[PDB]
Amino acid sequence: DDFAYLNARVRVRRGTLLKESFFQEALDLSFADFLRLLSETVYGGELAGQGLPDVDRAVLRTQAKLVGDLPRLVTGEAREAVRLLLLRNDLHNLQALLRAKATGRPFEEVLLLPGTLREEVWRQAYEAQDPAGMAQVLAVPGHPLARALRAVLRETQDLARVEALLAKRFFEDVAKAAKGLDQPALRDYLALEVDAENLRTAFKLQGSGLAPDAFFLKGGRFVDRVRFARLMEGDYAVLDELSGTPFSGLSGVRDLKALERGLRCVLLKEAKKGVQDPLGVGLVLAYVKEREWEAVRLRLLARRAYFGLPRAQVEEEVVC
């Protein structure tokens, strides 16, 4: 462990982060001009065709090389900390894949965050014949989500419950690994990720009649068991009671889309606090999250330009 060498490599990578004016110009371009603007960034080195799927592939391959290689640059404790960040992105990816598969979204529209598994592993998991085949695909590289998915599917096959319990189980495992590190920035970010997952789980399971304690994740900071239970009962005022916390901007949120938007913005702002940290995981955490948000926004704006959607239909989604 230490982050000195990694940090110096990352400060050089941050020089290729896309600036805000990229995203502001892109809102008003045709798809040809979007492609041109993209070709002048670091993503242009992976842009191999002129169609929408080519932009998505250019994003995936670029992020693989600028983020997915990070654990190779550190060892011991520092490597464990970086690995946890990427694993949390594998959890996002599996959740996104399950929901796509269940709801009729093709694999090509699934947002894959930079993680520890190759794209072809996710495609194979999507394509598998049944959930057993999906788990075996994850088990070949020995990924810990394979066992977690098996354990959750034994208990329930309802999509929203499977997503919630998979997160619960992942964060319960991350917590044991994370407790063995001493990274104050990671401790603050993890506590906020727990609060956020609790809020999304409570919102999604609202009115199902479930007992909240099977679903509540410990380890948070601002979202207590009683508010989680109240929101899972259908009390939306919980989202209005968070003044004085990082979640105070959730006030007035009354749909999942606006929730997930709000949550991503809260976590990005928190990840940004550590960009100038000389010690520990803060700078790599900030860099990974900024690259995540860059990928999310590139895919949305690529679609807006390709299909010619109005700017107001998408601007709210790409700004915090």
Q: What is the DSSP string of 240-257?
A: GS-TTSTTGGGTT--SHH
Which fold does the domain 76-181 belong to in CATH? V-type ATP synthase subunit C fold (1.20.1690)
CA distance 284 to 9: 10
| DSSP per-residue codes, 101-151 | HHHT--GGG----S-SS-HHHHHHHHHSSSHHHHHHHHHTTT-HHHHHHHH
Q: Judge whether 1-75+280-320 and 182-279 match in fold.
A: no
What CA–CA distance (Å, rounded) separates 196 from 289?
A: 15
- For the record, the structure tokens of 153 come out as 């599917």
Contact 184, 207 (CB under 8 A): no
Cα-trace Rg, the chain? 19
Q: Is 276 exposed, middle or buried (0-12, 13-18, 19+ CB in 10 A)?
A: exposed
182-279 CATH fold: V-type ATP synthase subunit C fold (1.20.1690)
Tokens representing residue 151 in the block: 């354990």
Copy the structure tokens of residue 248. Answer: 């105070």
Question: CB–CB of 236/256 below 8 Å?
Answer: no
For residue 230 the two structure tokens come to: 């109240």
CA distance 84 to 277: 19
Nearest to 302 by CA among 32, 72, 45: 32
Residues 6+ apart with CB under 8 A from 107: 97, 100, 122, 123, 126, 127
Q: What phi and psi values does residue 227 have, to the nearest 5 degrees?
A: -65, -40
In one-letter notation, the amino acid at residue 234 is G
For residues 52 and 305, the answer to whether their CB atoms sit within 8 Å is: no
CB 213 within 8 A of CB 225: yes
Tokens of 119: 């794209």
Fold for the domain defined by 1-75+280-320: Topoisomerase I; Chain A, domain 4 (1.10.132)
- Domain residue limits, the chain: 1-75+280-320, 76-181, 182-279
Element (DSSP H or E) covering residue 174: helix 159-179
Tokens of 304: 């807006």
- Which of 178, 219, 184 is closest to 77 using CA atoms? 178
In the 8-state DSSP scheme, what is residue 311? T
Question: What are the two backbone dihedrals, phi and then psi, of residue 221, each rounded to the nearest 5 degrees?
Answer: -145, -45
Using CA atoms, how far apart are residues 306 and 205, in angstroms rounded to an integer?
A: 35
Tokens of 208: 């199902």
CA separation for the pair 134, 146 (Å, rounded): 8
> What are the two backbone dihedrals, phi and then psi, of residue 79, each rounded to the nearest 5 degrees?
-65, -35
* Amino acid code (one letter) for 82: V
Cα–Cα nearest to 279, from 109, 12, 77:
77
254 closest CA partner among 267, 237, 229, 233:
237
- Method used to determine the 3D structure: X-ray
CA 296/CA 265 separation, integer angstroms: 12
The burial class, CB within 10 Å (0-12 / 13-18 / 19+), for 40 is exposed
